[PDB]
Amino acid sequence: SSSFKAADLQLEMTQKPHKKPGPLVFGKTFTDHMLMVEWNDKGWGQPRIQPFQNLTLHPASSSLHYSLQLFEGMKAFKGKDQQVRLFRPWLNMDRMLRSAMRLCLPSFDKLELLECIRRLIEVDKDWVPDAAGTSLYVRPVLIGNEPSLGVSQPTRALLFVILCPVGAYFVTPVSLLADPAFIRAWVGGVGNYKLGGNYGPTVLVQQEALKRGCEQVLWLYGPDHQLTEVGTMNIFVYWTHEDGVLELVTPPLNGVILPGVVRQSLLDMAQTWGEFRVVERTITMKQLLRALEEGRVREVFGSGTACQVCPVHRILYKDRNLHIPTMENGPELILRFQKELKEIQYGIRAHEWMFPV
Amino acid sequence: SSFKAADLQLEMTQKPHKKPGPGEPLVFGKTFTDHMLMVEWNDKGWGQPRIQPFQNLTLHPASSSLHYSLQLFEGMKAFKGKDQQVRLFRPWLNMDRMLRSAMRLCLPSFDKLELLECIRRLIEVDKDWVPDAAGTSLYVRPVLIGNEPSLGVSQPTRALLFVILCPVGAYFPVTPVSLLADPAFIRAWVGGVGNYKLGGNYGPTVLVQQEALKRGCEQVLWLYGPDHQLTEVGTMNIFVYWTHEDGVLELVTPPLNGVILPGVVRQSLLDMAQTWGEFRVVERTITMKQLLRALEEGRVREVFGSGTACQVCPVHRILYKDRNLHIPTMENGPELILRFQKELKEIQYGIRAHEWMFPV
Numbered sequence: 001s002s003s004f005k006a007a008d009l010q011l012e013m014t015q016k017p018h019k020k021p022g023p024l025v026f027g028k029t030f031t032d033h034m035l036m037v038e039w040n041d042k043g044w045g046q047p048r049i050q051p052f053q054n055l056t057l058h059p060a061s062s063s064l065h066y067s068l069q070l071f072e073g074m075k076a077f078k079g080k081d082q083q084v085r086l087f088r089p090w091l092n093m094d095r096m097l098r099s100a101m102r103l104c105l106p107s108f109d110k111l112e113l114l115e116c117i118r119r120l121i122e123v124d125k126d127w128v129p130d131a132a133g134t135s136l137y138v139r140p141v142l143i144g145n146e147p148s149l150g151v152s153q154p155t156r157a158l159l160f161v162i163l164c165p166v167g168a169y170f171v172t173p174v175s176l177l178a179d180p181a182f183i184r185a186w187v188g189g190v191g192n193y194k195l196g197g198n199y200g201p202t203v204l205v206q207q208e209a210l211k212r213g214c215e216q217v218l219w220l221y222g223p224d225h226q227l228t229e230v231g232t233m234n235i236f237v238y239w240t241h242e243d244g245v246l247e248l249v250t251p252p253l254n255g256v257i258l259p260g261v262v263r264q265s266l267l268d269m270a271q272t273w274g275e276f277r278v279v280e281r282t283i284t285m286k287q288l289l290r291a292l293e294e295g296r297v298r299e300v301f302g303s304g305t306a307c308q309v310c311p312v313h314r315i316l317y318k319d320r321n322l323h324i325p326t327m328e329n330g331p332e333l334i335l336r337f338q339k340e341l342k343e344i345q346y347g348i349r350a351h352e353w354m355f356p357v
Numbered sequence: 358s359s360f361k362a363a364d365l366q367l368e369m370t371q372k373p374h375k376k377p378g379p380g381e382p383l384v385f386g387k388t389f390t391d392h393m394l395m396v397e398w399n400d401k402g403w404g405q406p407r408i409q410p411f412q413n414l415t416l417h418p419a420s421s422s423l424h425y426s427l428q429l430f431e432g433m434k435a436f437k438g439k440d441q442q443v444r445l446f447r448p449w450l451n452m453d454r455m456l457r458s459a460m461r462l463c464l465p466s467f468d469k470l471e472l473l474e475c476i477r478r479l480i481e482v483d484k485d486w487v488p489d490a491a492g493t494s495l496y497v498r499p500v501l502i503g504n505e506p507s508l509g510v511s512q513p514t515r516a517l518l519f520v521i522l523c524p525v526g527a528y529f530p531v532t533p534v535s536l537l538a539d540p541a542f543i544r545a546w547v548g549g550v551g552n553y554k555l556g557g558n559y560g561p562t563v564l565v566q567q568e569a570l571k572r573g574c575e576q577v578l579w580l581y582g583p584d585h586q587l588t589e590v591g592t593m594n595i596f597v598y599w600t601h602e603d604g605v606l607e608l609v610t611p612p613l614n615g616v617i618l619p620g621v622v623r624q625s626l627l628d629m630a631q632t633w634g635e636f637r638v639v640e641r642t643i644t645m646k647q648l649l650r651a652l653e654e655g656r657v658r659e660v661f662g663s664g665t666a667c668q669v670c671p672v673h674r675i676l677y678k679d680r681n682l683h684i685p686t687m688e689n690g691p692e693l694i695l696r697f698q699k700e701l702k703e704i705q706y707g708i709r710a711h712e713w714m715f716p717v
């Protein structure tokens with residue numbers, strides 16, 4: 001139905017701007033402004049940019065009772081020329097609309113939201129840092145807001161966006177706990193959408209990981225222990241495959257994998273190089289062990305917006321530590337992926353992937 | 358530590374809501390009472406509990422309750438008998454379940470008997486909102502949410518516990534319901550969180566419930582596994598009263614193996630039937646193959662869901678792919694259903710004193 005329009009934006013500037021930072025911790029520091037859009041039985045209201053402020057919700061809000069909530073995560077980068085650019089934001093907009101439809105929340109126009117986000121970033125561009133490795137994290141959210149305890153398609157909703165200046169998350173490698181007792185997502189489920197409900201249950205599992213000397217969780221699937229995701233990151237393996245061919249593999253989008261923007265960007269980059277096989281195929285612990293013993297594994301890493309390419313060096317599997325020679329192999333592929341992404345994101349090389357603010 | 362009911366502060370309302378009219382029927386979960394329970398937790402532990410005028414919540418925009426679904430809820434009923442005495446039905450079990458949910462989401466622990474007392478005190482304040490016409494009750498909705506103003510996926514250092522109340526009647530206008538049973542839809546899985554009453558389990562079902570409507574059915578029969586196990590009906594547990602394949606008369610409901618929410622009404626129906634000792638009462642997996650066969654052999658007496666909002670819900674039809682299966686629940690009395698409803702009514706409205714009722 002009829003989406004809100006960036007033409008109808010309403011600006012309300014803060015009366016007292018907040019003092020910028022001077023070691024930015026991920027997701028804790030927020031900027032002066034936010035986008036807010038209300039939806040109800042009269043359709044979408046006018047978007048507005050307003051000072052960062054608390055939400056007022058009815059205590060029966062379906063957002064809080066039945067997890068009618070979804071989110072996105074994407075980054076804006078400030079180049080030398082002081083120009084700010086979003087990385088592949090259309091893909092985030094596409095994913096967000098898919099999430100919306102899955103939870104029966106209102107459809108909106110992807111380009112209208114992008115423009116409202118652009119404007120919001122414009123208003124707050126001084127918050128976008130420019131130091132090496134820094135960026136602005138953009139967190140759009142769409143939540144149901146029905147004031148009723150019936151499990152139902154909501155007739156009210158709020159779409160809002162907040163911004164965080166950020167540095168890194170932690171090229172330092174990580175250890176993973178691989179315990180098949182915990183299952184992140186199931187074929188036929190909603191693991192392939194960026195819905196809040198997929199994340200809350202992982203908190204206890206991440207604590208078990210820390211208590212057991214690991215930093216992230218490696219989510220395994222199926223009776224053949226398929227490697228699916230690392231924490232909130234897609235997983236990649238750079239090895240020589242069972243048929244003697246050097247390749248980059250990541251599991252295919254079969255339902256239990258969130259289709260990451262960085263994931264897709266790395267598959268694209270590597271395909272464009274034309275220097276080795278790039279494939280989407282199931283990866284099992286059985287295959288990984290055999291390859292590790294036969295010395296065919298060069299690099300293992302996770303990919304995601306907050307930690308774009310995360311080296312892995314250890315997997316704790318069936319109480320037995322497995323060493324991953326990632327850091328011993330350069331890590332060349334990882335360093336090469338990081339360099340090209342940096343050149344693109346900071347505008348050193350022009351690229352259609354970037355959207356200027 | 359825990360908040361204490363001894364520390365309760367009361368703020369009475371200065372804008373009381375007009376209560377539901379005479380010929381104005383109660384719609385489930387839409388009408389709220391005048392007051393609410395509110396308790397905050399942070400690095401200092403739990404603050405003091407407050408009973409306060411029903412009012413909006415004020416949440417930071419990065420609240421982890423809204424980004425990563427750090428949220429759980431409960432649902433239980435208070436019943437007013439003819440002598441105007443209000444009683445809660447087996448609230449201890451909801452308190453137990455709420456605390457398990459909390460631990461699963463790394464949300465803060467609390468004292469079950471302190472929460473129960475705060476809830477009793479809350480209902481006492483709004484006692485006149487408890488209706489007393491037949492089949493009516495007061496639905497009680499506790500909630501516990503994470504409230505970390507941080508975008509990292511982590512254990513919150515701040516939380517919020519609150520409770521709101523609604524006067525209710527029946528969920529639907531003992532008219533049986535039809536169910537959509539399609540194996541494409543998966544509510545929960547072994548190793549997941551289907552056995553906890555966490556907000557994240559419900560949101561994904563809204564779309565599936567719309568497909569049930571679109572295909573002419575009223576609720577979703579959630580199927581699991583290669584063998585199409587019957588797990589749950591909508592937000593209710595499922596029971597089958599049949600003559601099994603070994604020729605024995607039994608009431609069966611799926612076992613608590615991870616994909617089943619352990620209902621209070623479920624447990625109570627098992628307790629009641631087990632206590633009668635008139636037939637076999639088991640927890641065992643139930644498959645579509647088994648149901649299909651039992652229906653063609655006329656061994657099925659009654660099928661029904663159980664849950665707080667619709668305590669004993671008869672089923673008359675199941676649309677399994679294209680096979681429209683008639684369930685003969687209503688032609689069989691429904692004798693067991695009526696018996697369960699009659700006993701529950703006697704216990705709930707205080708006709709017959711019982712250890713299951715907690716007086717307010």
Ligand SMILES: *Cc1c(COP(=O)(O)O)cnc(C)c1O
Nearest residue numbers: 232233234258260261262304305
């Ligand atoms: C967000 C996310 C990813 C990666 O997504 P990006 O779009 O690259 O940031 C991968 N797996 C899970 C489970 C995620 O939530």
Ligand SMILES: *Cc1c(COP(=O)(O)O)cnc(C)c1O
Nearest residue numbers: 592593594618620621622664665
């Ligand atoms: C709440 C619930 C039930 C039944 O719980 P009761 O405690 O009897 O009200 C059954 N199934 C699901 C999925 C539920 O959420």
Ligand SMILES: CCc1cc(=O)n2nc(C)c(C#N)c2[nH]1
Nearest residue numbers: 073232233304305306307509510
């Ligand atoms: C989805 C936002 C987010 C939260 C969070 O705690 N993490 N942790 C990591 C390692 C990432 C990434 N990428 C991430 N991303």
Ligand SMILES: CCc1cc(=O)n2nc(C)c(C#N)c2[nH]1
Nearest residue numbers: 150151432592593664665666667
């Ligand atoms: C959990 C509260 C609740 C919401 C809702 O939409 N429903 N629908 C039904 C049939 C029930 C029950 N029991 C129920 N219970």
Ligand SMILES: [Cl-]
Nearest residue numbers: 192253255259
């Ligand atoms: Cl997908």
Ligand SMILES: [Cl-]
Nearest residue numbers: 447449450713
């Ligand atoms: Cl009890």
Ligand SMILES: [Cl-]
Nearest residue numbers: 552613615619
């Ligand atoms: Cl259980």
